[PDB]
Amino acid sequence: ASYMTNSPTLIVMIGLPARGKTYVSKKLTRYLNWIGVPTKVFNLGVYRREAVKSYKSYDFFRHDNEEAMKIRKQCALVALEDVKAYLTEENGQIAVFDATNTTRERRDMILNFAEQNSFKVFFVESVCDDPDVIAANILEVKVSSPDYPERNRENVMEDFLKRIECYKVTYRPLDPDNYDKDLSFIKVINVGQRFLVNRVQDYIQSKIVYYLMNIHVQPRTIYLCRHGESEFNLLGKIGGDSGLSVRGKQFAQALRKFLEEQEITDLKVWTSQLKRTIQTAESLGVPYEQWKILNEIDAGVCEEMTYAEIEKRYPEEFALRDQEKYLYRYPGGESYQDLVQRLEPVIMELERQGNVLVISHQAVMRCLLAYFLDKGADELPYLRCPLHTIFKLTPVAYGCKVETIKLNVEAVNTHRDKPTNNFPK
């Protein structure tokens, strides 16, 4: 009177080692938080390493190893108690349980935990049988996984290959035709070549599946920059549709040279529909695609004004925006929250693809950086993205490599800091 319509959700990863589970867990968790759903990942690798206080050879992972199996089960129970605390005491809505969970006994233990606590359960099983995908994932584990010592990885590969065989002995995949016909799940096959989806129960499960249709697990690189310096940038005017300054044109030429030197396979170039990004791309000698949704934030009645003019003409609005820069909405225009919402299709295409250069704008690029660098709404409107600097991004399971490349053309500074040190607040 009522029942289970308002329950939180436990997303349970399944798979053999080196299947992309931790990458998927982390990026899915970031996406769910991005759309406003409080979500936390629980990485059982961390739990078990902290419990045994040493790195473990493949024999630790034998299903026969009674002593190891008992330690590993206890770690799962501790993590589940942390899941419960998060979802019932800490205002979490979704918990993501990143572990192998390859046996039916372990999955039934999780399901019984969820039923006792009225948590919905959705399984994400990563199945890789393509030799190239497998060999790639395994090599990535060998090089970067923290489940082995930081240095001296010469014997990691041989051990890890044997650890996988231990899991293969007892692995029961989800069986949609019989044993698991009533469970809600998705099998992600070969990191997203195809999918088997069973019994999607509700809106949030549809969003989870939606996100996983856009994820890309193999290493990829994306490039972000602004249009070259514009005339309005030189004037300190926001918004508008002005063209490149002569220095912005020099930047566009330098950008062409930089892209040639980078030797990028199958480069795609995306711009907005505003002249300054188009003009930047036109100098590159390669096809490009304009996106309306990459247009700069709309400043409404403040379009084409300087900050000094805005503070003078609209002192109350100007102070409000400084107090609440993410949520503030220009009269007749947009807030950063509005901008975030309309950027979602570009963000999904950038989750999917590598070798894309996005030529956009200060506020737009802040949103894209906040998404791929996992920054919150508080910091998002203040992220620094100078004119004539390229951001080169390589996402990894626990974050994103960022390289900045300042090209050799000067530009004005358009970054206004939040006012500091004022009294009262």
Ligand X SMILES: Nc1ncnc2c1ncn2[C@@H]1O[C@H](COP(=O)(O)OP(=O)(O)OP(=O)(O)O)[C@@H](O)[C@H]1O
Mark whether 296 is an active-site residue: yes
- Secondary structure (H, E, C), the chain: CCCCCCCCEEEEEECCCCCCHHHHHHHHHHHHHHCCCCEEEEEHHHHHHHHHCCCCCHHHHCCCCHHHHHHHHHHHHHHHHHHHHHHHHCCCCEEEEECCCCCHHHHHHHHHHHHHHCCEEEEEEEECCCHHHHHHHHHHHHHHCCCCCCCCCCCHHHHHHHHHHHHHHHCCCCCCCCCCCCCCEEEEEHHHCEEEEECCCCHHHHHHHHHHCCCCCCCCCEEEEECCCEHHHHHCECCCCCCECHHHHHHHHHHHHHHHHHCCCCCEEEECCCHHHHHHHHCCCCCCEECHHHCCCCCHHHCCCEHHHHHHHCHHHHHHHHHCCCCCCCCCCCCHHHHHHHCHHHHHHHHHCCCEEEEECHHHHHHHHHHHCCCCCCCHHHCCCCCCEEEEEEEECCEEEEEEEECCCCCCCCCCCCCCCCCCC
Residue 93 CB, shortest distance to a second copy, in Å, is 13
Mark whether 415 is an active-site residue: no
Residue 348 CB, shortest distance to a second copy, in Å, is 5
Residue 297 CB, shortest distance to a second copy, in Å, is 15
Does 17 participate in binding ligand X (rule CB under 6 A)? Answer: yes
Binder of residue 45, out of ligand F6P, ligand X, a second copy, none (CB less than 5 to 8 A by kind): ligand X
Catalytic residue among 98, 317, 334, 351: 98
- Give the Cα separation of 107 and 100 in Å (integer): 10
Stretch that binds ligand X, among 17-25, 165-173, 387-395, 412-420 (CB under 6 A): 17-25
Q: What is the total count of residues that contact ligand X (CB under 6 A)?
A: 21
x/- binding map, residues 379-418, to ligand X, per CB under 6 A? -----------------xxx--------------------
Stretch that binds ligand X, among 13-21, 34-42, 68-76, 113-121 (CB under 6 A): 13-21
Catalytic residue among 75, 128, 166, 302: 128
Q: Is 320 annotated as a binding residue?
A: yes
Does 297 participate in binding ligand F6P (rule CB under 6 A)? Answer: yes
Residues in region 345-404 near ligand F6P by CB under 6 A:
361-363, 381
Residue choice 21, 48, 107, 247 for contact with ligand X (CB under 6 A): 21
Binder of residue 21, out of a second copy, ligand F6P, ligand X, none (CB less than 5 to 8 A by kind): ligand X
Residue 248 CB, shortest distance to ligand F6P, in Å, is 12
Mark whether 260 is an active-site residue: no
Mark whether 361 is an active-site residue: no
Residue 215 CB, shortest distance to ligand X, in Å, is 13
Binder of residue 297, out of ligand X, a second copy, ligand F6P, none (CB less than 5 to 8 A by kind): ligand F6P
Q: Is 20 annotated as a binding residue?
A: yes
Give the residue with the Cβ less far from a second copy, 162 or 329.
329
Annotated binding residues for ATP: 15-23, 137-142, 318-321, 362-366, 398
Which residues does the annotation place in the binding site for beta-D-fructose 6-phosphate? 48, 72, 100, 106, 142, 163, 167
